Design a protein around this ligand. Structure first.
Ligand SMILES: Nc1nc2c(ncn2[C@@H]2O[C@H](COP(=O)(O)OP(=O)(O)O)[C@@H](O)[C@H]2O)c(=O)[nH]1
Ligand SMILES: [Mg+2]
Length: 417
């Protein structure tokens, strides 16, 4: 979908959400690999370390409203009035579904304070999120988004309830297994966003009140027991960062109205004030947490391998075993190393004999190929990979065989000139 600009005196492609995880009507789960590759394997982002921002929680609790303002920020980080004009209707940016995961088609490229340009990915994860519902659709889409995310924004209404915390059991024992095998915490940031907070006199709006409130909800106490003692004891060994932000109610007009579409000044003022703090608190350059596993920052190319590894175990009749989750993580970590190594081979061959570049003598083509293949083998060998050397051996063999396939296609192409 293109659209006219005249700001650029030109047509421009229209960014929008893209369905990547799909819960079908028979309750089967499909990953749209094609759609995912189109977004994450493009030349501008493929090699960039990725920040995967997920917003997840129950239907109809303001996830798409909040992501509208996330888009406002990401598109106007330079301006200090990124939020828009108050006597203006909320123009410009809109997300809006069924159970699944959508991603914003445009990957944002941001400079971290130290100067590294990273890629920011935005995800919206929806389901019923009712723990008494007897079907696993919402749990699996929530587990998957969390496994993919480096910032998971858990969007809740009014409180953190025991049943909200029970969903974190999906990653409890995995996080310990992962912990014990990599000697590092498996996840980066978890954020409890409490909407419609009504008790600012007890815990103030925003991050500081949020911290104290969460600390008191997360107390272990034998009145919970029932493995919510457990989840509370283990959540910190899963996540590098855990925090909580309390947000006022937006006012009647916003609540009672699907797509309220009015002047920003009609929204409740305290809510707008805290929303303007929330978004940069989540998404500013210093705040962006790069996806990371086994001490390796993950790229847009690499992240695709985590998508593919996880869908394998989240499909089927039931949720996966915790050891299967860890197996899937180790498999993606090795395949990400394969993709990186294969990529640098591919780019360097492309420079030597792709395009209209002149014919190459076959012996010289071969000698250049062997040198580049061996460089990528050493590159792959040097990556700190999960699973141990026997586990990784089969992935080295896959890299060698995929590089060979590339070389054959270059021979074929070089034979046409
Ligand atoms: N009570 C309440 N309603 C909200 C909030 N933010 C947005 N809404 C409204 O709730 C309705 C559904 O919101 P939506 O973003 O589509 O929810 P989603 O299904 O989680 O994405 C819309 O009319 C919004 O205007 C909030 O913080 N609190
Ligand atoms: Mg939504």
């Amino acid at each position: 979908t293109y659209e006219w600009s005249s700001e650029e005196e030109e047509p421009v492609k229209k960014a929008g959400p893209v369905q990547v995880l799909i819960v079908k009507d028979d309750h089967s789960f499909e990953l749209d690999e094609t759609a995912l590759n189109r977004i994450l394997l493009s030349e501008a982002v493929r090699d960039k370390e990725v920040v995967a921002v997920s917003v997840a929680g129950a239907f109809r609790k303001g996830k798409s409203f909040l992501m509208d303002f996330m888009l406002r920020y990401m598109y106007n980080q330079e301006s200090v009035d990124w939020v828009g004009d108050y006597n203006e209707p909320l123009t410009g940016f809109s997300w809006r579904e069924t159970t699944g995961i959508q991603i914003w088609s445009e990957i944002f490229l941001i400079n971290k304070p130290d100067g590294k340009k990273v890629a920011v990915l935005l995800m919206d994860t929806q389901g019923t999120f009712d723990s008494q519902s007897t079907l696993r659709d919402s749990a699996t889409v929530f587990a998957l988004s969390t496994m993919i995310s480096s910032i998971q924004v858990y969007n809740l209404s009014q409180n953190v309830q025991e049943d909200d915390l029970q969903h974190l059991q999906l990653f409890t024992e995995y996080g310990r297994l992962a912990m014990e095998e990599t000697f590092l915490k498996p996840f980066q940031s978890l954020i409890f966003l409490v909407r419609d907070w009504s008790f600012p006199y007890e815990f103030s709006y925003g991050a500081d009140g949020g911290a104290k409130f969460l600390e008191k909800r997360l107390k272990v106490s034998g009145n919970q027991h029932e493995e919510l003692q457990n989840v509370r004891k283990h959540i910190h060994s899963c996540f590098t960062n855990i925090s909580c932000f309390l947000l006022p109610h937006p006012g009647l007009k916003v609540a009672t109205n699907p797509n309220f579409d009015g002047k920003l000044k009609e929204i409740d003022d305290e809510f707008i004030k805290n929303l303007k703090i929330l978004i940069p608190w989540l998404l500013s350059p210093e705040s962006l947490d790069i996806k990371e596993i086994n001490g390796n920052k993950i790229t847009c190319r690499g992240l695709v391998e985590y998508f593919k590894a996880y869908i394998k175990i989240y499909q089927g009749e039931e949720l996966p075993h915790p050891k299967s989750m860890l197996q899937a993580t180790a498999e993606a970590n090795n395949l990400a190393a394969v993709a990186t190594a294969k990529d640098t081979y591919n780019k360097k061959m492309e420079e030597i004999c792709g395009g209209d570049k002149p014919f190459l003598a076959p012996n010289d083509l071969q000698t250049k190929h062997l040198q580049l293949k061996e460089e990528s083998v050493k590159l792959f060998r040097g990556v700190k990979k999960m699973g141990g050397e026997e586990f990784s051996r089969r992935y080295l063999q896959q890299l060698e065989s995929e590089i060979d396939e590339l070389y054959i296609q270059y021979i074929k192409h070089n034979d046409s000139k």
